[PDB]
Design a binder for these strands. Structure first.
Lengths: 102, 94, 97, 89, 102, 97
DNA sequence: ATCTGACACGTGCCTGGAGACTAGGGAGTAATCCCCTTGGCGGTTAAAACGCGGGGGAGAATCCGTACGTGCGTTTAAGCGGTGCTAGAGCTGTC
DNA sequence: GACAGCTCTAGCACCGCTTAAACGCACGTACGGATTCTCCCCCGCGTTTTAACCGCCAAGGGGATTACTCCCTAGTCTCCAGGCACGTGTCAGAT
């Protein structure tokens, strides 16, 4: 989102209703690149010390994480809507993860 | 018996038969690959990417854009129930 | 998810956790939702790095390239159509932030 | 990769529509992964006695992966391509 | 359940609360063989006439079907308990199937 | 599921659909539960037979044997460990009713 | 209206792609044995479908505390960009 | 495939600077939880119809099995031109 020449399609502060329509129109990833690289090197430090990460590998790692996280939350929204509620809670996401792995 | 063209030109296919045969033969599945399996695999890829390009072009034209982008390819997939089942487990780029 | 986050490690920021819910179409978000979100992103990256590192060890390299991540992606039977080439980063790309 | 083949198809279908370079790479990766799933399906459907893949193996593999109306139209296009190739060898 | 040998837990208009305890103790299939053979030949007859079905193929077809059907109904029970309800409804099974294919 | 059941073709008896629920651990079942349960089995049997028919047809046989369903079972990425033999169904087995 | 920089276009080439025997294997065909599949019939009889009071689960309406949307400001750090360094990929050539 | 050596694309670091963006806080309103009440429909039990399954039977259709014949395709050599990278114009689209 903060990357130069990206289709963010968001204009500063927005309300919750306008954020849904804005995020359905953009294509950029929504986790910053610096903090994703910091996490990527930190977990790899527990197995292999001093491992460099290529910039091409970081982009493919982030795309897989974004698509898997959004797919879980779309499944977590279905359980919330099936319980006649409009607020996604912590139990709904944990139920959505358990319904596919467990 | 027609030496004026390639394998794709002989079968009147836009997908290259030679590259589709390379995917089939070098997949580590079997020792021997026949000639007819190479042409058939290229035609199966060609027909259904014509289906995707037809839906993506209509989606791009409806958005008043002359260039097919990633979002137009993505939006064409869930608009077809039959096409979505094939590539529903695929990562459509965030 | 529940207890995959540990104090001492860098994690996903709280506003980025809420933006994940907006892309899923959720109109209202609970205040305890940041904990399972931070766990799942941490879990998926832990899974992705662990498969990719042993792909690097067998090839006797020291840098995780794009081929090691791609082989880690197909090892979980998850097809990936986003392959970053040298022309990536052009305009409105899917690999940008 | 299938970059040039997929670009030539777009000119035949929509003559006034271009394609993003990033979109062309994603469509090529669809073609490779569609080739992988059909070929792996054709290897599975072969009997243990046989060792080669004929045209009938790819025809039945496309029917299994592609459901209902797409599968029936697949066999018609694949057979017409083989018979055209079988007369212009 | 109606075949020879063994594999039956309890009979005699046995109550519903006891049925959950009994069905976790048995190991046999719970779909009749004759009705499953009539079903299996009927699907083949719509696509290809005069198809014989092996007796060994019939058993392994039925084992796959119930193991997928029970796995769906276990996932449907989770959504029912997630909505603070104890009765499995028609919408819970439809939601459970939609959460993995859709 | 909802519309995969059709009149004119044989289906599961009503009592056997309730037995499938009790194996899952459900205590209370609604009256309109038979229609989705009959739909899912009829879908899964239609999926398994369609894969098995093409394996049989490609081998130029006319009888669906255990090898055809086995190629059909793992084509859907579903591992099966209950492979029947000639000694199957002895005293209490996974294949009896 | 005004950039801009990404896509269309022109060029060099070399490695992918096609053509022509060869022969050996694997696919196809046909006859024969007999194993296993369909059909069914007497009887069982356990299971399935049907019907009838009766209570527990779900739905509806009301009330409310508290947890979340939302402006507003303060605070922190992600990113351009440019720079420079150098750890380490790529390729070549045995053995 | 392991090992060594030369070359050089690229990943790390950092400083300047910007500035979009994240965090926290006060105000208020919508909403899920709690409660009561009521409806209705599903579990429990008895009865009756009915079809799945035993044994045991028989005919026979097609799965294995073997042997013969021959279609074609991996292999080797030769030739060639088509798609891909490098560099550059210029117009589709965001602002």
């Amino acid at each position: 989102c903060r990357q130069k020449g990206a289709g963010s399609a968001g204009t500063g502060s927005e309300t919750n209703s306008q954020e849904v329509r804005s995020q359905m129109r953009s294509t950029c990833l929504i986790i910053p690149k610096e903090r994703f690289r910091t996490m990527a090197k930190e977990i790899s430090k527990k197995e292999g010390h001093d491992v460099h990460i290529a910039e091409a590998a970081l982009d493919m790692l982030q795309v897989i994480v974004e698509s898997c996280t959004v797919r879980l939350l779309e499944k977590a929204l279905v359980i919330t809507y099936s319980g006649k509620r409009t607020r996604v809670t912590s139990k709904d996401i944990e139920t959505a993860f358990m319904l596919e792995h467990g | 018996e027609s030496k004026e063209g390639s394998r794709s030109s002989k079968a009147k296919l836009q997908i290259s038969v030679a590259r589709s045969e390379r995917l089939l033969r070098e997949h580590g599945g079997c020792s021997r690959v026949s000639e007819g399996a190479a042409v058939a695999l290229a035609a199966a890829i060609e027909y259904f990417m014509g289906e995707v390009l037809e839906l993506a072009g209509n989606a791009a034209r409806d958005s008043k854009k002359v260039r097919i982008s990633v979002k137009h390819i993505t939006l064409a997939i869930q608009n077809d129930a039959a096409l979505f089942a094939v590539v529903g487990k695929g990562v459509f780029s965030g | 998810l529940a207890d995959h986050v540990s104090v001492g490690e860098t994690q996903i920021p709280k506003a980025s956790t809420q933006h994940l819910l907006r892309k899923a179409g959720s109109l209202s978000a609970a205040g305890d939702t940041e904990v399972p979100i931070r766990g799942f992103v941490h879990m998926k990256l832990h899974k992705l790095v662990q498969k990719s590192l042993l792909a690097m060890q067998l090839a006797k390299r020291k840098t995780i390239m794009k081929s090691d991540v791609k082989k880690a992606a197909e090892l979980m039977h998850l097809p990936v159509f986003a392959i970053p080439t040298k022309d990536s980063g052009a305009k409105g790309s899917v690999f940008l932030s | 990769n299938f970059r040039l083949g997929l670009r030539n198809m777009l000119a035949q279908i929509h003559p006034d529509i271009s394609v993003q370079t990033e979109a062309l790479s994603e469509l090529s990766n669809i073609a490779v992964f569609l080739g992988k799933k059909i070929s792996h399906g054709a290897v599975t459907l072969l009997p243990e006695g046989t060792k080669t893949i004929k045209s009938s193996a790819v025809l039945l593999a496309a029917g299994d992966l592609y459901g209902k109306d797409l599968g029936r139209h697949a066999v018609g296009e694949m057979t017409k391509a083989v018979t055209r190739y079988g007369s212009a060898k």
